[PDB]
Amino acid sequence: TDKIYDALEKLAEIQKEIAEFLRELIEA
Amino acid sequence: TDKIYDALEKLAEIQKEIAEFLRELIEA
Amino acid sequence: TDKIYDALEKLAEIQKEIAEFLRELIEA
Amino acid sequence: TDKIYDALEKLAEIQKEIAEFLRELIEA
Amino acid sequence: TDKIYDALEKLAEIQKEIAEFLRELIEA
Amino acid sequence: TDKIYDALEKLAEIQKEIAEFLRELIEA
Numbered sequence: 572t573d574k575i576y577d578a579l580e581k582l583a584e585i586q587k588e589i590a591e592f593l594r595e596l597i598e599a
Numbered sequence: 600t601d602k603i604y605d606a607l608e609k610l611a612e613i614q615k616e617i618a619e620f621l622r623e624l625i626e627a
Numbered sequence: 628t629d630k631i632y633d634a635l636e637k638l639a640e641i642q643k644e645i646a647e648f649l650r651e652l653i654e655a
Numbered sequence: 656t657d658k659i660y661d662a663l664e665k666l667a668e669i670q671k672e673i674a675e676f677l678r679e680l681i682e683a
Numbered sequence: 684t685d686k687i688y689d690a691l692e693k694l695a696e697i698q699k700e701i702a703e704f705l706r707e708l709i710e711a
Numbered sequence: 712t713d714k715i716y717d718a719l720e721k722l723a724e725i726q727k728e729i730a731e732f733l734r735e736l737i738e739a
Contacts, residue, residue, distance in 0.1 A: 573739075578624070579662055579663075581623075583732055585617060585620065586642070586729055587730075588613050589649075590673070590722065590729060592610055592613060592649070593649075594719060594722050595606070596606060599603070603653060610649055610650050610653065613646055614650070617646060621636070624632065624635060625636075631663075637704055638704065641670055641704065645673065645677075645697060651690070652681075657711075660708065663708060664705070665732055669725065670701055671701050671702075672725050674697055676722055678698070679718070680718060681690055681691055683715070
C-alpha cells in the first residue's frame with residue numbers, strides 16, 4: 572500500500588540523513 | 600568545538616524527524 | 628498489515644537507538 | 656507483500672552496515 | 684577509554700537487536 | 712588518517728546502497 576511505501580521512503584530518507592551526518596562528522 | 604555543538608544540533612533534528620515518523624506511525 | 632506496521636515500528640526504534648548512540652558518543 | 660518484505664530486509668541490512676561502520680569507527 | 688568500551692557494548696546491543704529483527708523477518 | 716579516508720569510502724558505499732534503495736523504491 573502506497574502509505575506503506577511512503578513510510579518506507581520517509582524511513583529511508585532518515586538513514587540517508589544519518590549517513591549524511593556520519594560523513595559530515597568524519598571530517599573532524 | 601562549536602562544530603561539535605552544530606553536530607549535536609543537526610543530529611538532534613534527525614531525532615526530531617525520527618520521533619515525527621514514530622508518532623505519525625502510531626495512529627496505525 | 629499490522630505485522631508490517633510493527634515491523635516498521637521495531638525498525639524505527641533501532642534508528643532511534645542509533646541516533647541515541649550517536650549523540651551519546653558526541654559528548655566524547 | 657513479499658516485495659515489501661524484501662524492501663524491509665534490504666533496508667535492515669543498511670542499518671546493519673551502518674552499525675558495522677559505527678563499531679568499525681570506534682576502534683579509532 | 685572505558686567510556687569507549689561501554690560505547691562499543693551499547694553499540695553491540697543495537698546490532699544484537701538488528702540481528703533479532705533480521706532473523707525475525709526471515710520467517711516471512 | 713588513511714584509516715579515516717577508508718572510513719569515508721566504506722561510508723560512501725553505504726550511501727550508494729541507500730541511494731540504490733531509494734531509486735529502486737521510487738518506481739513504486
